[PDB]
Amino acid sequence: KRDREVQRTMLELLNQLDGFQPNTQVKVIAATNRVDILDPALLRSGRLDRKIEFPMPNEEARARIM
Amino acid sequence: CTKIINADSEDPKYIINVKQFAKFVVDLSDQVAPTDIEEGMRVGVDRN
Amino acid sequence: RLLDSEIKIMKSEVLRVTHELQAMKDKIKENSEKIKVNKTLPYLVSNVIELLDVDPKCAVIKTSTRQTYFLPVIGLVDAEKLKPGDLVGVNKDSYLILETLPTEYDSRVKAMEVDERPTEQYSDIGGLDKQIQELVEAIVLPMNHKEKFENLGIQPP
Amino acid sequence: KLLEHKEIDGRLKELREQLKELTKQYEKSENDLKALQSVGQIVGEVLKQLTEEKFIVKATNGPRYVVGCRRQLDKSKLKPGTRVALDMTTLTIMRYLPREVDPLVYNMSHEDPGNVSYSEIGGLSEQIRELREVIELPLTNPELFQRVGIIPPKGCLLYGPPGTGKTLLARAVASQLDCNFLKVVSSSIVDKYIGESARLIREMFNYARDHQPCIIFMDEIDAIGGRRFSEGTSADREIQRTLMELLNQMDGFDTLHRVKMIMATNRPDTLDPALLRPGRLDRKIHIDLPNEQARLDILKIHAGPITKHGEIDYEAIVKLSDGFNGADLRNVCTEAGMFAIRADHDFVVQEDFMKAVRKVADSKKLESKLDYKPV
Ligand SMILES: Nc1ncnc2c1ncn2[C@@H]1O[C@H](COP(=O)(O)OP(=O)(O)OP(=O)(O)O)[C@@H](O)[C@H]1O
Ligand SMILES: [Mg+2]
């Protein structure tokens, strides 16, 4: 969330993600275990259109896993 | 080393970075095969 | 009568122009060979700066050896092929540009790309069919189709 | 009897074409060979002038060389600070050049934002109208304020939560206005070489001054605009150095002529009070979350191109769209289209939009819109 060096790199990251002439044909996938640290603008709908929640495996899901 | 050109694949040309000194486009000595060089590779070069 | 008189000129002109073409080709061969042997292969890569207009084909160069140079003539590369900030290989002594080069980005970024191409199939992922379908339709469909979106008109995620 | 005549005439014409092509090859060869024998020239910036034949040049990042003008250069043009080229042999000046360097500024100018009309933004009429009063009217019609008497503000800042259209508004301004426009990512103007970022700020301001009228846009200004640390690493040192450089550039003693400036930030609080001082950033523009009417407007904007099927009730979507930032509604349209894709349909209906709204409202719980502060 918003040591200013990591902040500046992160800001460069969101500006690359948004982008003048946005995104051309470049798709981005991100994986985290702790959303609460991400917060202010990285989770913005523009930069990350889809938030996909991974729950603990279901019982039938666990059976398929094994 | 960096980004083998390989435009004509005969003498593929090699860009190197003599760190603290300069960057260059160079070839290989005839002793070392191109298959012996990958990207980066920390390669040593002659002085001339 | 006719068609029998012009025969001398129409072929003699062709043969003489062919000989002229042969000599002209020889001159081109000599020039090309001298230029090629002139193309030494250290090139001291350098970044391109503003292409200032000519005034009585001018480029300003920042070298990899942290020096700036002005070129009255670019060299063996076309002017508009250059884009300030571009990377060119120049003469190690006269600093004339004789190359066009791929940009190169960084060692980290080149190590960043995937060449192994791992081999996990969606079948090995279990119990996430909602999530797998979500990610697949979010990413792969713009990669493959790109016509469903334009037909609907939406900007793909 | 056309066979021999016309066939051999065509042969001669074809051979003439091959000759002109080959002579074009030779012209290229001789021209580049003549260009080959030339040599480059060192570049450096003429300092104080001693006599009409003695000059002082700092050869860029090299030393300071006493040199003399060649023969033809108008000595008047060789002003203290102008950029000249020197022979690498005798070091004599032989041509003054356009002022300075740095293709970084070139990229930050030739950035292409795309065509974005003000109509493509929705629900910001007051702010959009406000910006044109400080960004467009002064440079288009300066003579107006002469009679008003009030001097024009030079910089003004856009602040608001993520996803309300700040960068979009900047893109629109860049696209529609006919003037020189600089686009800044506040991160990339921060380089590791000692004292290079302040130099870059200086050169970009110089480029703006030389190319008047000019617009500077600094997105995420909080990257360097942060409050000045009392102590820190080289990071704090050089970042505050660059901040004070930018300050001297815009604050005063230089009284920027046509250097109207725009910046945006998601965190206006962290900005140093020196920036937020009115003399630099006179018109602070708050770009709030879109209102329900504004939400309907932007929804109409982004749902427009969609090949809908049947009626669309934007009002219900607005009703369920509580607290959505502007970017969210674009995500709403995208998700409705994606639901239509899932149904394999070639059209989108109201229920697709409704499902999209529910889906992004669920995601809305993730982006914790904190106790957010203005400047
Ligand atoms: N009022 C609006 N009208 C139209 N589209 C809007 C509006 N507000 C937001 N949007 C949409 O949301 C995005 C606007 O976000 P933009 O990239 O301009 O920056 P931001 O979210 O304001 O902040 P930053 O880029 O500084 O993090 C665009 O994709 C645009 O289509
Ligand atoms: Mg922005």
PDB file of N, CA, C and O in Angstrom, chain A residues 1-5 7-9 11-16 18-22 35-36 39-51 53, chain D residues 111-113 162-163 167 171 183 185 187 190 217 219-220 222-223 229 235 239 266-267 325 327-328 330-331 335 338 359 363 366-368 370 372:
ATOM      1  N   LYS A   1       0.819  -1.200   0.000  1.00  0.00           N
ATOM      2  CA  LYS A   1       0.000   0.000   0.000  1.00  0.00           C
ATOM      3  C   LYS A   1       0.861   1.263   0.000  1.00  0.00           C
ATOM      4  O   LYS A   1       2.065   1.239   0.269  1.00  0.00           O
ATOM      5  N   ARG A   2       0.212   2.384  -0.299  1.00  0.00           N
ATOM      6  CA  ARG A   2       0.881   3.676  -0.350  1.00  0.00           C
ATOM      7  C   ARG A   2       0.862   4.363   1.010  1.00  0.00           C
ATOM      8  O   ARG A   2      -0.168   4.878   1.440  1.00  0.00           O
ATOM      9  N   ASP A   3      11.414   4.039   1.729  1.00  0.00           N
ATOM     10  CA  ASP A   3      10.514   3.026   1.193  1.00  0.00           C
ATOM     11  C   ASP A   3       9.780   3.552  -0.034  1.00  0.00           C
ATOM     12  O   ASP A   3       8.991   2.841  -0.652  1.00  0.00           O
ATOM     13  N   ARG A   4      10.053   4.809  -0.388  1.00  0.00           N
ATOM     14  CA  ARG A   4       9.395   5.408  -1.543  1.00  0.00           C
ATOM     15  C   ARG A   4       9.881   4.800  -2.852  1.00  0.00           C
ATOM     16  O   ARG A   4       9.273   5.027  -3.903  1.00  0.00           O
ATOM     17  N   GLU A   5      10.970   4.030  -2.815  1.00  0.00           N
ATOM     18  CA  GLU A   5      11.485   3.405  -4.030  1.00  0.00           C
ATOM     19  C   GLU A   5      10.516   2.359  -4.570  1.00  0.00           C
ATOM     20  O   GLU A   5      10.177   2.355  -5.762  1.00  0.00           O
ATOM     21  N   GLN A   7       7.440   2.272  -3.862  1.00  0.00           N
ATOM     22  CA  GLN A   7       6.263   3.035  -4.255  1.00  0.00           C
ATOM     23  C   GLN A   7       6.396   3.548  -5.682  1.00  0.00           C
ATOM     24  O   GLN A   7       5.455   3.467  -6.473  1.00  0.00           O
ATOM     25  N   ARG A   8       7.566   4.087  -6.024  1.00  0.00           N
ATOM     26  CA  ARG A   8       7.765   4.626  -7.366  1.00  0.00           C
ATOM     27  C   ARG A   8       7.740   3.523  -8.414  1.00  0.00           C
ATOM     28  O   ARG A   8       7.174   3.702  -9.501  1.00  0.00           O
ATOM     29  N   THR A   9       8.349   2.374  -8.114  1.00  0.00           N
ATOM     30  CA  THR A   9       8.276   1.257  -9.052  1.00  0.00           C
ATOM     31  C   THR A   9       6.837   0.796  -9.238  1.00  0.00           C
ATOM     32  O   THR A   9       6.406   0.506 -10.360  1.00  0.00           O
ATOM     33  N   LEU A  11       4.152   2.644  -8.896  1.00  0.00           N
ATOM     34  CA  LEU A  11       3.483   3.656  -9.706  1.00  0.00           C
ATOM     35  C   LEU A  11       3.823   3.506 -11.179  1.00  0.00           C
ATOM     36  O   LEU A  11       2.934   3.612 -12.034  1.00  0.00           O
ATOM     37  N   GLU A  12       5.091   3.252 -11.495  1.00  0.00           N
ATOM     38  CA  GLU A  12       5.446   2.940 -12.871  1.00  0.00           C
ATOM     39  C   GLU A  12       4.655   1.740 -13.365  1.00  0.00           C
ATOM     40  O   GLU A  12       4.229   1.693 -14.524  1.00  0.00           O
ATOM     41  N   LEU A  13       4.442   0.761 -12.486  1.00  0.00           N
ATOM     42  CA  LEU A  13       3.687  -0.425 -12.872  1.00  0.00           C
ATOM     43  C   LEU A  13       2.249  -0.076 -13.235  1.00  0.00           C
ATOM     44  O   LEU A  13       1.735  -0.543 -14.255  1.00  0.00           O
ATOM     45  N   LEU A  14       1.578   0.743 -12.419  1.00  0.00           N
ATOM     46  CA  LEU A  14       0.185   1.054 -12.741  1.00  0.00           C
ATOM     47  C   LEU A  14       0.090   1.928 -13.983  1.00  0.00           C
ATOM     48  O   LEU A  14      -0.863   1.812 -14.758  1.00  0.00           O
ATOM     49  N   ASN A  15       1.047   2.836 -14.178  1.00  0.00           N
ATOM     50  CA  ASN A  15       1.012   3.635 -15.401  1.00  0.00           C
ATOM     51  C   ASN A  15       1.282   2.792 -16.642  1.00  0.00           C
ATOM     52  O   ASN A  15       0.692   3.046 -17.697  1.00  0.00           O
ATOM     53  N   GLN A  16       2.164   1.795 -16.547  1.00  0.00           N
ATOM     54  CA  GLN A  16       2.326   0.857 -17.652  1.00  0.00           C
ATOM     55  C   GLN A  16       1.050   0.060 -17.877  1.00  0.00           C
ATOM     56  O   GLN A  16       0.640  -0.163 -19.022  1.00  0.00           O
ATOM     57  N   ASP A  18      -2.119   0.934 -17.154  1.00  0.00           N
ATOM     58  CA  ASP A  18      -3.106   1.785 -17.802  1.00  0.00           C
ATOM     59  C   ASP A  18      -2.637   2.185 -19.192  1.00  0.00           C
ATOM     60  O   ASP A  18      -3.216   1.760 -20.197  1.00  0.00           O
ATOM     61  N   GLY A  19      -1.582   2.988 -19.271  1.00  0.00           N
ATOM     62  CA  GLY A  19      -0.901   3.200 -20.530  1.00  0.00           C
ATOM     63  C   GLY A  19      -1.601   4.171 -21.455  1.00  0.00           C
ATOM     64  O   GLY A  19      -2.808   4.058 -21.682  1.00  0.00           O
ATOM     65  N   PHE A  20      -0.858   5.124 -22.002  1.00  0.00           N
ATOM     66  CA  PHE A  20      -1.378   5.898 -23.117  1.00  0.00           C
ATOM     67  C   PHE A  20      -1.406   5.000 -24.345  1.00  0.00           C
ATOM     68  O   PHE A  20      -0.425   4.304 -24.626  1.00  0.00           O
ATOM     69  N   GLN A  21      -2.524   5.017 -25.077  1.00  0.00           N
ATOM     70  CA  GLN A  21      -2.846   3.948 -26.017  1.00  0.00           C
ATOM     71  C   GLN A  21      -2.787   2.636 -25.240  1.00  0.00           C
ATOM     72  O   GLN A  21      -1.823   1.870 -25.365  1.00  0.00           O
ATOM     73  N   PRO A  22      -3.788   2.375 -24.401  1.00  0.00           N
ATOM     74  CA  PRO A  22      -3.662   1.321 -23.386  1.00  0.00           C
ATOM     75  C   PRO A  22      -3.429  -0.067 -23.967  1.00  0.00           C
ATOM     76  O   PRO A  22      -4.049  -0.467 -24.955  1.00  0.00           O
ATOM     77  N   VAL A  35      -4.465  -9.875  -0.364  1.00  0.00           N
ATOM     78  CA  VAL A  35      -5.041  -8.739  -1.077  1.00  0.00           C
ATOM     79  C   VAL A  35      -4.953  -7.472  -0.241  1.00  0.00           C
ATOM     80  O   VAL A  35      -4.791  -6.368  -0.774  1.00  0.00           O
ATOM     81  N   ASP A  36      -5.070  -7.607   1.082  1.00  0.00           N
ATOM     82  CA  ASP A  36      -5.175  -6.438   1.952  1.00  0.00           C
ATOM     83  C   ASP A  36      -3.959  -5.525   1.840  1.00  0.00           C
ATOM     84  O   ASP A  36      -4.049  -4.336   2.168  1.00  0.00           O
ATOM     85  N   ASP A  39      -4.495  -2.966  -1.949  1.00  0.00           N
ATOM     86  CA  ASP A  39      -5.468  -1.881  -1.800  1.00  0.00           C
ATOM     87  C   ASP A  39      -5.458  -0.806  -2.894  1.00  0.00           C
ATOM     88  O   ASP A  39      -5.923  -1.085  -4.006  1.00  0.00           O
ATOM     89  N   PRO A  40      -4.922   0.421  -2.648  1.00  0.00           N
ATOM     90  CA  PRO A  40      -5.588   1.623  -3.177  1.00  0.00           C
ATOM     91  C   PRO A  40      -5.964   1.616  -4.652  1.00  0.00           C
ATOM     92  O   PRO A  40      -7.149   1.721  -4.981  1.00  0.00           O
ATOM     93  N   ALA A  41      -4.990   1.488  -5.549  1.00  0.00           N
ATOM     94  CA  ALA A  41      -5.247   1.681  -6.967  1.00  0.00           C
ATOM     95  C   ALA A  41      -4.814   0.520  -7.844  1.00  0.00           C
ATOM     96  O   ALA A  41      -5.175   0.499  -9.025  1.00  0.00           O
ATOM     97  N   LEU A  42      -4.043  -0.429  -7.320  1.00  0.00           N
ATOM     98  CA  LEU A  42      -3.699  -1.612  -8.099  1.00  0.00           C
ATOM     99  C   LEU A  42      -4.932  -2.469  -8.352  1.00  0.00           C
ATOM    100  O   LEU A  42      -5.040  -3.139  -9.385  1.00  0.00           O
ATOM    101  N   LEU A  43      -5.877  -2.455  -7.417  1.00  0.00           N
ATOM    102  CA  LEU A  43      -7.090  -3.249  -7.539  1.00  0.00           C
ATOM    103  C   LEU A  43      -8.150  -2.506  -8.340  1.00  0.00           C
ATOM    104  O   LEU A  43      -9.287  -2.974  -8.454  1.00  0.00           O
ATOM    105  N   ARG A  44      -7.796  -1.345  -8.881  1.00  0.00           N
ATOM    106  CA  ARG A  44      -8.732  -0.572  -9.679  1.00  0.00           C
ATOM    107  C   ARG A  44      -9.269  -1.416 -10.833  1.00  0.00           C
ATOM    108  O   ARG A  44      -8.563  -2.238 -11.422  1.00  0.00           O
ATOM    109  N   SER A  45     -10.549  -1.209 -11.140  1.00  0.00           N
ATOM    110  CA  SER A  45     -11.216  -2.018 -12.154  1.00  0.00           C
ATOM    111  C   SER A  45     -10.523  -1.898 -13.504  1.00  0.00           C
ATOM    112  O   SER A  45     -10.474  -2.865 -14.274  1.00  0.00           O
ATOM    113  N   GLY A  46      -9.993  -0.718 -13.817  1.00  0.00           N
ATOM    114  CA  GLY A  46      -9.321  -0.545 -15.094  1.00  0.00           C
ATOM    115  C   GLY A  46      -8.097  -1.425 -15.239  1.00  0.00           C
ATOM    116  O   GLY A  46      -7.939  -2.135 -16.232  1.00  0.00           O
ATOM    117  N   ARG A  47      -7.225  -1.414 -14.231  1.00  0.00           N
ATOM    118  CA  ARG A  47      -5.953  -2.118 -14.352  1.00  0.00           C
ATOM    119  C   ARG A  47      -6.138  -3.625 -14.232  1.00  0.00           C
ATOM    120  O   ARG A  47      -5.518  -4.398 -14.968  1.00  0.00           O
ATOM    121  N   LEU A  48      -6.988  -4.062 -13.308  1.00  0.00           N
ATOM    122  CA  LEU A  48      -7.277  -5.481 -13.103  1.00  0.00           C
ATOM    123  C   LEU A  48      -8.779  -5.673 -13.253  1.00  0.00           C
ATOM    124  O   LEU A  48      -9.535  -5.554 -12.287  1.00  0.00           O
ATOM    125  N   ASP A  49      -9.209  -5.974 -14.480  1.00  0.00           N
ATOM    126  CA  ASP A  49     -10.634  -6.085 -14.763  1.00  0.00           C
ATOM    127  C   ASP A  49     -11.279  -7.187 -13.936  1.00  0.00           C
ATOM    128  O   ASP A  49     -12.367  -7.007 -13.377  1.00  0.00           O
ATOM    129  N   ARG A  50     -10.619  -8.335 -13.840  1.00  0.00           N
ATOM    130  CA  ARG A  50     -11.192  -9.516 -13.215  1.00  0.00           C
ATOM    131  C   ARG A  50     -10.406  -9.876 -11.965  1.00  0.00           C
ATOM    132  O   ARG A  50      -9.189 -10.078 -12.029  1.00  0.00           O
ATOM    133  N   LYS A  51     -11.099  -9.959 -10.836  1.00  0.00           N
ATOM    134  CA  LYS A  51     -10.542 -10.511  -9.612  1.00  0.00           C
ATOM    135  C   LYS A  51     -11.099 -11.910  -9.420  1.00  0.00           C
ATOM    136  O   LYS A  51     -12.315 -12.087  -9.288  1.00  0.00           O
ATOM    137  N   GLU A  53     -11.192 -15.212  -7.167  1.00  0.00           N
ATOM    138  CA  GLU A  53     -10.965 -15.719  -5.824  1.00  0.00           C
ATOM    139  C   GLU A  53     -10.719 -17.217  -5.877  1.00  0.00           C
ATOM    140  O   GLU A  53     -11.448 -17.948  -6.554  1.00  0.00           O
TER     141      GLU A  53
ATOM    142  N   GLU D 111       4.282  11.211 -27.151  1.00  0.00           N
ATOM    143  CA  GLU D 111       3.373  10.195 -26.644  1.00  0.00           C
ATOM    144  C   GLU D 111       2.000  10.396 -27.274  1.00  0.00           C
ATOM    145  O   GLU D 111       1.486  11.518 -27.300  1.00  0.00           O
ATOM    146  N   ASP D 112       1.399   9.323 -27.788  1.00  0.00           N
ATOM    147  CA  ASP D 112       0.127   9.432 -28.486  1.00  0.00           C
ATOM    148  C   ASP D 112      -0.994   8.970 -27.572  1.00  0.00           C
ATOM    149  O   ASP D 112      -1.091   7.766 -27.285  1.00  0.00           O
ATOM    150  N   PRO D 113      -1.862   9.871 -27.102  1.00  0.00           N
ATOM    151  CA  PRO D 113      -2.940   9.448 -26.201  1.00  0.00           C
ATOM    152  C   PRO D 113      -4.155   8.889 -26.914  1.00  0.00           C
ATOM    153  O   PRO D 113      -5.004   8.275 -26.256  1.00  0.00           O
ATOM    154  N   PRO D 162      -8.844   6.596  -7.184  1.00  0.00           N
ATOM    155  CA  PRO D 162      -8.560   5.918  -8.452  1.00  0.00           C
ATOM    156  C   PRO D 162      -9.828   5.655  -9.249  1.00  0.00           C
ATOM    157  O   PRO D 162     -10.885   5.352  -8.692  1.00  0.00           O
ATOM    158  N   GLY D 163      -9.716   5.779 -10.567  1.00  0.00           N
ATOM    159  CA  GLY D 163     -10.802   5.407 -11.452  1.00  0.00           C
ATOM    160  C   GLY D 163     -11.882   6.444 -11.646  1.00  0.00           C
ATOM    161  O   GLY D 163     -13.046   6.081 -11.855  1.00  0.00           O
ATOM    162  N   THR D 167      -6.450  10.763 -15.592  1.00  0.00           N
ATOM    163  CA  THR D 167      -5.592  10.501 -16.740  1.00  0.00           C
ATOM    164  C   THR D 167      -6.382  10.576 -18.038  1.00  0.00           C
ATOM    165  O   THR D 167      -5.862  11.026 -19.064  1.00  0.00           O
ATOM    166  N   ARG D 171      -5.612  12.926 -21.207  1.00  0.00           N
ATOM    167  CA  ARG D 171      -5.528  12.404 -22.565  1.00  0.00           C
ATOM    168  C   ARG D 171      -6.420  13.191 -23.509  1.00  0.00           C
ATOM    169  O   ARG D 171      -6.034  13.496 -24.642  1.00  0.00           O
ATOM    170  N   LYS D 183       3.913  14.538 -21.689  1.00  0.00           N
ATOM    171  CA  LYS D 183       3.277  13.520 -20.871  1.00  0.00           C
ATOM    172  C   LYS D 183       4.346  12.899 -19.978  1.00  0.00           C
ATOM    173  O   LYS D 183       5.363  12.402 -20.468  1.00  0.00           O
ATOM    174  N   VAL D 185       5.285  10.262 -16.776  1.00  0.00           N
ATOM    175  CA  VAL D 185       5.161   9.317 -15.675  1.00  0.00           C
ATOM    176  C   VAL D 185       6.210   9.705 -14.644  1.00  0.00           C
ATOM    177  O   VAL D 185       7.412   9.699 -14.934  1.00  0.00           O
ATOM    178  N   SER D 187       7.546   8.365 -12.299  1.00  0.00           N
ATOM    179  CA  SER D 187       8.579   7.384 -11.995  1.00  0.00           C
ATOM    180  C   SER D 187       9.739   7.448 -12.977  1.00  0.00           C
ATOM    181  O   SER D 187      10.902   7.424 -12.561  1.00  0.00           O
ATOM    182  N   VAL D 190      12.893   9.672 -12.918  1.00  0.00           N
ATOM    183  CA  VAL D 190      13.729   9.464 -11.744  1.00  0.00           C
ATOM    184  C   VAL D 190      14.794   8.425 -12.073  1.00  0.00           C
ATOM    185  O   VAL D 190      14.543   7.218 -11.988  1.00  0.00           O
ATOM    186  N   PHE D 217       2.196  17.573 -18.503  1.00  0.00           N
ATOM    187  CA  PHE D 217       1.337  16.714 -17.703  1.00  0.00           C
ATOM    188  C   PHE D 217       2.194  15.742 -16.917  1.00  0.00           C
ATOM    189  O   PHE D 217       2.939  14.957 -17.507  1.00  0.00           O
ATOM    190  N   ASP D 219       1.682  12.806 -14.412  1.00  0.00           N
ATOM    191  CA  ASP D 219       0.806  11.861 -13.738  1.00  0.00           C
ATOM    192  C   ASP D 219       1.527  11.254 -12.541  1.00  0.00           C
ATOM    193  O   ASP D 219       2.752  11.111 -12.545  1.00  0.00           O
ATOM    194  N   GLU D 220       0.755  10.894 -11.515  1.00  0.00           N
ATOM    195  CA  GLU D 220       1.271  10.341 -10.265  1.00  0.00           C
ATOM    196  C   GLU D 220       2.363  11.205  -9.651  1.00  0.00           C
ATOM    197  O   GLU D 220       3.402  10.683  -9.238  1.00  0.00           O
ATOM    198  N   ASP D 222       2.829  12.363  -6.985  1.00  0.00           N
ATOM    199  CA  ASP D 222       3.209  11.980  -5.630  1.00  0.00           C
ATOM    200  C   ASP D 222       4.443  11.090  -5.613  1.00  0.00           C
ATOM    201  O   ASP D 222       5.037  10.876  -4.550  1.00  0.00           O
ATOM    202  N   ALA D 223       4.838  10.552  -6.769  1.00  0.00           N
ATOM    203  CA  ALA D 223       6.038   9.723  -6.833  1.00  0.00           C
ATOM    204  C   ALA D 223       7.269  10.511  -6.405  1.00  0.00           C
ATOM    205  O   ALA D 223       8.139   9.995  -5.694  1.00  0.00           O
ATOM    206  N   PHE D 229      11.660  14.267   3.387  1.00  0.00           N
ATOM    207  CA  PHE D 229      12.231  13.612   4.554  1.00  0.00           C
ATOM    208  C   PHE D 229      13.359  14.456   5.133  1.00  0.00           C
ATOM    209  O   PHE D 229      14.115  15.107   4.406  1.00  0.00           O
ATOM    210  N   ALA D 235      18.257   7.854  -2.027  1.00  0.00           N
ATOM    211  CA  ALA D 235      16.910   7.992  -2.557  1.00  0.00           C
ATOM    212  C   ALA D 235      16.268   9.285  -2.078  1.00  0.00           C
ATOM    213  O   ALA D 235      15.833  10.101  -2.894  1.00  0.00           O
ATOM    214  N   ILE D 239      15.762  12.497  -4.515  1.00  0.00           N
ATOM    215  CA  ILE D 239      14.356  12.747  -4.810  1.00  0.00           C
ATOM    216  C   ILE D 239      13.954  14.135  -4.336  1.00  0.00           C
ATOM    217  O   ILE D 239      13.295  14.885  -5.066  1.00  0.00           O
ATOM    218  N   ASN D 266      -3.239  10.235  -7.067  1.00  0.00           N
ATOM    219  CA  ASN D 266      -4.207   9.515  -6.252  1.00  0.00           C
ATOM    220  C   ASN D 266      -4.064   9.827  -4.771  1.00  0.00           C
ATOM    221  O   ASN D 266      -5.002   9.584  -4.005  1.00  0.00           O
ATOM    222  N   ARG D 267      -2.918  10.360  -4.356  1.00  0.00           N
ATOM    223  CA  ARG D 267      -2.630  10.634  -2.948  1.00  0.00           C
ATOM    224  C   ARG D 267      -2.155  12.073  -2.795  1.00  0.00           C
ATOM    225  O   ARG D 267      -0.969  12.332  -2.572  1.00  0.00           O
ATOM    226  N   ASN D 325     -16.481   3.928  -8.880  1.00  0.00           N
ATOM    227  CA  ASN D 325     -15.702   4.924  -9.596  1.00  0.00           C
ATOM    228  C   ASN D 325     -15.966   4.801 -11.091  1.00  0.00           C
ATOM    229  O   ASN D 325     -16.564   3.830 -11.559  1.00  0.00           O
ATOM    230  N   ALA D 327     -14.110   4.187 -13.715  1.00  0.00           N
ATOM    231  CA  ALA D 327     -13.540   3.046 -14.421  1.00  0.00           C
ATOM    232  C   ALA D 327     -14.374   1.788 -14.220  1.00  0.00           C
ATOM    233  O   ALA D 327     -14.374   0.893 -15.071  1.00  0.00           O
ATOM    234  N   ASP D 328     -15.088   1.701 -13.097  1.00  0.00           N
ATOM    235  CA  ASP D 328     -15.887   0.516 -12.805  1.00  0.00           C
ATOM    236  C   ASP D 328     -16.969   0.290 -13.853  1.00  0.00           C
ATOM    237  O   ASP D 328     -17.239  -0.847 -14.250  1.00  0.00           O
ATOM    238  N   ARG D 330     -17.047   1.099 -16.995  1.00  0.00           N
ATOM    239  CA  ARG D 330     -16.430   0.464 -18.154  1.00  0.00           C
ATOM    240  C   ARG D 330     -16.270  -1.031 -17.912  1.00  0.00           C
ATOM    241  O   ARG D 330     -16.550  -1.848 -18.799  1.00  0.00           O
ATOM    242  N   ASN D 331     -15.828  -1.405 -16.711  1.00  0.00           N
ATOM    243  CA  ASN D 331     -15.751  -2.816 -16.362  1.00  0.00           C
ATOM    244  C   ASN D 331     -17.131  -3.457 -16.378  1.00  0.00           C
ATOM    245  O   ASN D 331     -17.268  -4.636 -16.713  1.00  0.00           O
ATOM    246  N   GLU D 335     -17.915  -6.654 -18.632  1.00  0.00           N
ATOM    247  CA  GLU D 335     -18.404  -7.897 -18.053  1.00  0.00           C
ATOM    248  C   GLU D 335     -19.749  -8.299 -18.641  1.00  0.00           C
ATOM    249  O   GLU D 335     -20.020  -9.493 -18.794  1.00  0.00           O
ATOM    250  N   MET D 338     -18.915  -9.895 -21.748  1.00  0.00           N
ATOM    251  CA  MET D 338     -18.328 -11.206 -21.499  1.00  0.00           C
ATOM    252  C   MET D 338     -19.399 -12.236 -21.156  1.00  0.00           C
ATOM    253  O   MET D 338     -19.297 -13.403 -21.548  1.00  0.00           O
ATOM    254  N   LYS D 359     -21.485  -8.777 -10.316  1.00  0.00           N
ATOM    255  CA  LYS D 359     -20.137  -9.325 -10.259  1.00  0.00           C
ATOM    256  C   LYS D 359     -19.119  -8.267  -9.853  1.00  0.00           C
ATOM    257  O   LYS D 359     -18.229  -8.536  -9.038  1.00  0.00           O
ATOM    258  N   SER D 363     -16.687  -7.562  -6.473  1.00  0.00           N
ATOM    259  CA  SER D 363     -15.282  -7.173  -6.515  1.00  0.00           C
ATOM    260  C   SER D 363     -15.066  -5.821  -5.849  1.00  0.00           C
ATOM    261  O   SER D 363     -13.962  -5.525  -5.376  1.00  0.00           O
ATOM    262  N   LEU D 366     -13.492  -5.768  -2.498  1.00  0.00           N
ATOM    263  CA  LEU D 366     -12.055  -5.975  -2.370  1.00  0.00           C
ATOM    264  C   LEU D 366     -11.291  -4.660  -2.329  1.00  0.00           C
ATOM    265  O   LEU D 366     -10.454  -4.462  -1.443  1.00  0.00           O
ATOM    266  N   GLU D 367     -11.558  -3.753  -3.271  1.00  0.00           N
ATOM    267  CA  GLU D 367     -10.876  -2.461  -3.295  1.00  0.00           C
ATOM    268  C   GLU D 367     -11.430  -1.611  -2.154  1.00  0.00           C
ATOM    269  O   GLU D 367     -12.439  -0.911  -2.274  1.00  0.00           O
ATOM    270  N   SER D 368     -10.738  -1.687  -1.020  1.00  0.00           N
ATOM    271  CA  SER D 368     -11.168  -1.002   0.195  1.00  0.00           C
ATOM    272  C   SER D 368     -10.967   0.494  -0.012  1.00  0.00           C
ATOM    273  O   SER D 368      -9.871   1.038   0.141  1.00  0.00           O
ATOM    274  N   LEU D 370     -10.576   3.560   1.169  1.00  0.00           N
ATOM    275  CA  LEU D 370     -10.220   3.881   2.541  1.00  0.00           C
ATOM    276  C   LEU D 370     -10.781   5.244   2.935  1.00  0.00           C
ATOM    277  O   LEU D 370     -11.494   5.907   2.174  1.00  0.00           O
ATOM    278  N   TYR D 372     -10.269   8.276   2.579  1.00  0.00           N
ATOM    279  CA  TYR D 372      -9.407   8.890   1.577  1.00  0.00           C
ATOM    280  C   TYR D 372      -9.342  10.390   1.811  1.00  0.00           C
ATOM    281  O   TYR D 372     -10.355  11.015   2.143  1.00  0.00           O
TER     282      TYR D 372
END
